[PDB]
Amino acid sequence: HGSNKLPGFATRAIHHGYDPQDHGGALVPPVYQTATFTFPTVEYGAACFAGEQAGHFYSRISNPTLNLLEARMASLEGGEAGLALASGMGAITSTLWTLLRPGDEVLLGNTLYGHTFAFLHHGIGEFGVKLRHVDMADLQALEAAMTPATRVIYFESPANPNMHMADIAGVAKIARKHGATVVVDNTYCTPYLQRPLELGADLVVHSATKYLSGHGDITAGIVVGSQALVDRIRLQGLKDMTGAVLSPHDAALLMRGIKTLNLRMDRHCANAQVLAEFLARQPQVELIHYPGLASFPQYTLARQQMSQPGGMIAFELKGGIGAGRRFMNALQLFSRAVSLGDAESLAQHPASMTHSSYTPEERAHYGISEGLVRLSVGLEDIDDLLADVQQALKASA
Amino acid sequence: LPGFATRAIHHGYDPQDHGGALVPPVYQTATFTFPTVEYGAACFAGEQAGHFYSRISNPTLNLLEARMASLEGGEAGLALASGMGAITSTLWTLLRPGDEVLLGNTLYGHTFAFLHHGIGEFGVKLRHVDMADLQALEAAMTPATRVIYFESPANPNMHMADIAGVAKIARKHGATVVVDNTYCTPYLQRPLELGADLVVHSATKYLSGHGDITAGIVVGSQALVDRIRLQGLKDMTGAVLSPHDAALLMRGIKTLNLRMDRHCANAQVLAEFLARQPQVELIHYPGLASFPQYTLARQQMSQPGGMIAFELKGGIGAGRRFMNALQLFSRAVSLGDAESLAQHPASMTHSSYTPEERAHYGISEGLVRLSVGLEDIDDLLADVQQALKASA
Ligand code: MET
Ligand code: MET
């Protein structure tokens, strides 16, 4: 019993931070689709530029619809404070622009989302910030790479595109010892499956464009961490260095999506578990990577830090670059698209799609096979998804 | 070649291409799918025209961008999540450590903050110069000068730049001229036609016109815009504009001409009034004969705009009393809305500063700025009148 008990995840996803009685009984929070806020007095106005008063002035810095979204994402991640941005890249760039100056070093996971890699190497890397890639699964190697200039450790777990994982608590422990800020891109899991801040990370970023929205109709990013770090990112990264302002309309849609997060994630995971087990037994499949199978290289780390194994599958077809094209073109229910976490099931074959400008030789040493297909398993009836994949495997043979 | 108002309503869109829809459907979608991997292939290389991901390209955003490009008379447009998004995406693309950016003497506050505390701390060099003083500008040019950036007119005294003269100087040195054209809009001033390479807008202001969206625009040559899209936007800021907000912005642009006409007509009346009030020490409105750059104003701007800055004799105290008395004008930052807005920096935005810190940025103790809106002028006059009375 007792009132000091934390409400369950689904309760907070739906209610946290909002009481209808503070807004004329409105069951759904009204949408503050306004660019600016006014003051009753110039002295009240002075107080919102001098930090004496809680309030609002300009939606780029702060907005009540965005604030609700932010406090709710903070609650779900177990962090102190949230920030909502125009995209995942908005969240990532606003964060790193704030935390890094010339001479600082960022240690990076070995593989990264493509635009993240490009921001680092062709963006902030070109402004005097040093980059080093390390296998975050090898704690001994991470420890060895730390220098007094190391300011930020940044990685995804599971990471694009191989679902390589890092031990978050282990990384946090090394960073505590040396003094570095740990940021985890937690897009693939959501706070429903994994909570890096509870494992000792300082900040988490999300492409809310993916599972958090869940419906493929908005682009959005989220940062969650300590009040001090999130405030700094808000007032420097967002306000001055990116201008990546989330529309209140889209923030409201994001909050709508978050109300079913637990139910969608349950189904994404149950469907992908069924597909992965089916695919592991098909003749055309040479290799499958799914965190829910014992064949997964980091099976125990997955079980240890993710409450469920996710909705992403990667597998290799027998027949190389060819067989991929044939599998892909055959799909009738899965769509050929590069994204993830939609209600609609998506499939990509990077060899003949994203990385098709390269030759057979070149995709290696970036972690990309010739028959590597990636699946974002959606919310459709599993039997239809099974049938679609089955029929497409046949055509790929 | 259709007129401005025709283009603001129609340019880039034929209903017959979208099932007869008079108003273009809103592409509120994050991702786009491909009929084949082959069609897919020719999008991540980029020589077959289509779509892949709303962060790079999207048809609602594309229409907005074409429309804005047509109105400014430029080759290409880019739509971003805010004015700051447009400015940072631009400058992050164009500058690297060791490059220098030449700046107008005063700038929008968050632009100043970005330059001085953001990109400036990454080894990019900054120098402020008066962009109306062509010889000070020429003398300020160095081999490192890669970008010239300013607003015209500029806060807080509505100081103008000689856009054409700046551009002549810039091309001797190959430098890129970027003009923040927020205050005028393409309806009143077109910097690309005066020789600028790129224009940026806080579309949050006049372009939207209705105070309900945050948005930015860049317009310029295809090659520069392409790079700002693929580098500044995609990689360095992630300032993605919602398709919902883009559609609202296009809705607002359909009345740009009509709104700007009323903003200016209202502001001209208010300026004439203010200019002869005894409480008012000094006034800055491009439409007054007393405006120091009256002539340059009229060469660049087809109308004198909807913004007024003036200085009350009684200093900071008069400013506070003026501001607090306003009943129709709202005390708020921002501008370019239907609703009239006013601010007094010395007691609002820059209050925590000191008298000489404020003077250093050209912020007078009695300086108030009016964003004159669309309300009946007799009502706006009455509000200003009683506020002036209260200011004593
Ligand atoms: C390239 S847009 C983002 C889509 C998805 N996250 C991917 O891996 O490609
Ligand atoms: C300090 S919030 C941004 C400033 C406001 N847009 C202005 O016109 O002054």
Coordinates of N, CA, C and O in Angstrom, one line a residue, chain A residues 210-262:
Chain A
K210 N 10.6 7.7 -34.5 CA 10.5 6.3 -34.6 C 9.4 5.7 -33.6 O 8.2 6.1 -33.8
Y211 N 9.8 4.8 -32.7 CA 8.8 4.1 -31.9 C 8.0 5.0 -31.0 O 6.8 4.8 -30.7
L212 N 8.6 6.1 -30.4 CA 7.8 7.0 -29.5 C 6.5 7.5 -30.2 O 5.4 7.4 -29.6
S213 N 6.7 8.1 -31.4 CA 5.5 8.5 -32.2 C 4.7 7.3 -32.6 O 3.5 7.2 -32.4
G214 N 5.5 6.3 -33.1 CA 4.9 5.0 -33.5 C 4.0 5.0 -34.8 O 3.6 3.9 -35.2
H215 N 3.8 6.1 -35.4 CA 2.8 6.2 -36.4 C 3.3 6.8 -37.7 O 2.6 7.0 -38.7
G216 N 4.6 7.2 -37.7 CA 5.3 7.7 -38.9 C 4.8 9.0 -39.5 O 5.0 9.3 -40.7
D217 N 4.1 9.8 -38.7 CA 3.5 11.1 -39.1 C 4.3 12.3 -38.6 O 3.9 13.4 -39.0
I218 N 5.3 12.1 -37.8 CA 6.0 13.3 -37.3 C 7.5 13.0 -37.3 O 7.9 11.9 -37.2
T219 N 8.2 14.1 -37.2 CA 9.7 14.1 -37.0 C 9.9 14.8 -35.7 O 9.3 15.9 -35.5
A220 N 10.6 14.2 -34.8 CA 10.8 14.8 -33.4 C 12.0 14.1 -32.7 O 12.4 13.0 -33.0
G221 N 12.6 14.9 -31.8 CA 13.7 14.4 -31.0 C 13.4 14.7 -29.5 O 12.7 15.6 -29.2
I222 N 14.1 13.9 -28.7 CA 14.0 14.1 -27.2 C 15.4 14.0 -26.6 O 16.2 13.2 -27.0
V223 N 15.7 14.9 -25.6 CA 16.8 14.7 -24.7 C 16.3 14.6 -23.3 O 15.4 15.4 -22.9
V224 N 16.8 13.6 -22.5 CA 16.5 13.5 -21.1 C 17.8 13.3 -20.3 O 18.7 12.6 -20.7
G225 N 17.9 14.0 -19.2 CA 19.0 13.9 -18.3 C 18.8 14.8 -17.1 O 17.7 15.1 -16.7
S226 N 19.9 15.2 -16.5 CA 19.9 16.0 -15.3 C 19.4 17.4 -15.7 O 19.6 17.9 -16.8
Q227 N 18.7 18.1 -14.7 CA 18.3 19.4 -14.9 C 19.4 20.4 -15.4 O 19.2 21.2 -16.3
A228 N 20.6 20.2 -14.9 CA 21.7 21.1 -15.2 C 22.1 20.9 -16.7 O 22.2 21.9 -17.4
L229 N 22.2 19.7 -17.1 CA 22.6 19.4 -18.5 C 21.5 19.7 -19.5 O 21.8 20.3 -20.5
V230 N 20.3 19.4 -19.2 CA 19.2 19.6 -20.0 C 18.9 21.1 -20.2 O 18.7 21.6 -21.3
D231 N 19.1 21.9 -19.1 CA 18.9 23.4 -19.1 C 20.0 24.0 -20.1 O 19.7 24.9 -20.9
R232 N 21.2 23.5 -19.9 CA 22.3 24.0 -20.8 C 22.1 23.8 -22.3 O 22.3 24.6 -23.1
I233 N 21.6 22.6 -22.6 CA 21.3 22.2 -23.9 C 20.1 23.0 -24.5 O 20.2 23.5 -25.7
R234 N 19.1 23.2 -23.7 CA 18.0 24.1 -24.0 C 18.5 25.5 -24.4 O 18.2 26.0 -25.5
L235 N 19.3 26.1 -23.5 CA 19.7 27.5 -23.6 C 20.9 27.8 -24.5 O 21.1 28.9 -24.9
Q236 N 21.6 26.7 -24.9 CA 22.8 26.9 -25.8 C 22.5 26.1 -27.1 O 22.3 26.7 -28.2
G237 N 22.5 24.8 -27.0 CA 22.3 23.9 -28.2 C 21.1 24.3 -29.0 O 21.2 24.7 -30.1
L238 N 19.9 24.2 -28.3 CA 18.6 24.5 -29.0 C 18.5 26.0 -29.4 O 18.3 26.3 -30.5
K239 N 18.5 26.8 -28.3 CA 18.2 28.3 -28.5 C 19.1 29.0 -29.5 O 18.6 29.8 -30.3
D240 N 20.4 28.7 -29.5 CA 21.4 29.4 -30.2 C 22.0 28.7 -31.4 O 22.3 29.3 -32.4
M241 N 22.3 27.4 -31.2 CA 23.2 26.7 -32.1 C 22.5 25.8 -33.2 O 23.1 25.5 -34.2
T242 N 21.2 25.4 -32.9 CA 20.5 24.6 -33.9 C 19.1 25.2 -34.4 O 18.7 25.1 -35.5
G243 N 18.4 25.9 -33.4 CA 17.1 26.3 -33.7 C 16.1 25.2 -34.1 O 15.2 25.4 -34.8
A244 N 16.4 24.0 -33.6 CA 15.6 22.8 -33.9 C 14.3 22.7 -33.1 O 14.1 21.8 -32.2
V245 N 13.4 23.7 -33.3 CA 12.2 23.8 -32.5 C 11.1 22.8 -32.9 O 10.7 22.7 -34.1
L246 N 10.5 22.1 -31.9 CA 9.4 21.1 -32.2 C 8.1 21.9 -32.3 O 7.9 22.6 -31.3
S247 N 7.4 21.7 -33.3 CA 6.0 22.2 -33.4 C 5.1 21.7 -32.3 O 5.0 20.5 -32.0
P248 N 4.3 22.6 -31.6 CA 3.4 22.1 -30.6 C 2.4 21.1 -31.1 O 2.0 20.2 -30.4
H249 N 2.0 21.3 -32.4 CA 1.1 20.3 -33.0 C 1.7 18.9 -33.0 O 1.1 17.9 -32.7
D250 N 3.0 18.9 -33.4 CA 3.7 17.6 -33.5 C 4.0 17.0 -32.1 O 4.0 15.8 -31.9
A251 N 4.3 17.9 -31.1 CA 4.5 17.4 -29.8 C 3.2 16.8 -29.2 O 3.3 15.8 -28.5
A252 N 2.1 17.3 -29.6 CA 0.8 16.8 -29.2 C 0.6 15.4 -29.8 O 0.1 14.5 -29.1
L253 N 0.9 15.2 -31.1 CA 0.8 13.9 -31.7 C 1.8 12.9 -31.1 O 1.5 11.8 -30.9
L254 N 3.0 13.4 -30.7 CA 4.0 12.6 -30.0 C 3.4 12.0 -28.7 O 3.5 10.8 -28.4
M255 N 2.8 12.9 -27.9 CA 2.2 12.5 -26.7 C 1.0 11.6 -26.9 O 0.8 10.7 -26.0
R256 N 0.3 11.7 -27.9 CA -0.7 10.8 -28.3 C -0.2 9.4 -28.6 O -0.7 8.4 -28.0
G257 N 0.9 9.3 -29.4 CA 1.6 8.1 -29.6 C 2.2 7.4 -28.4 O 2.1 6.2 -28.2
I258 N 2.7 8.2 -27.4 CA 3.3 7.7 -26.2 C 2.2 7.0 -25.3 O 2.6 6.1 -24.6
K259 N 0.9 7.4 -25.4 CA -0.1 6.7 -24.7 C -0.3 5.3 -25.0 O -0.9 4.5 -24.1
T260 N 0.1 4.8 -26.1 CA 0.1 3.4 -26.5 C 1.4 2.8 -26.6 O 1.5 1.6 -27.0
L261 N 2.5 3.5 -26.1 CA 3.9 2.9 -26.3 C 4.0 1.5 -25.8 O 4.6 0.7 -26.5
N262 N 3.5 1.2 -24.6 CA 3.7 -0.1 -24.0 C 3.0 -1.2 -24.8 O 3.6 -2.3 -25.0

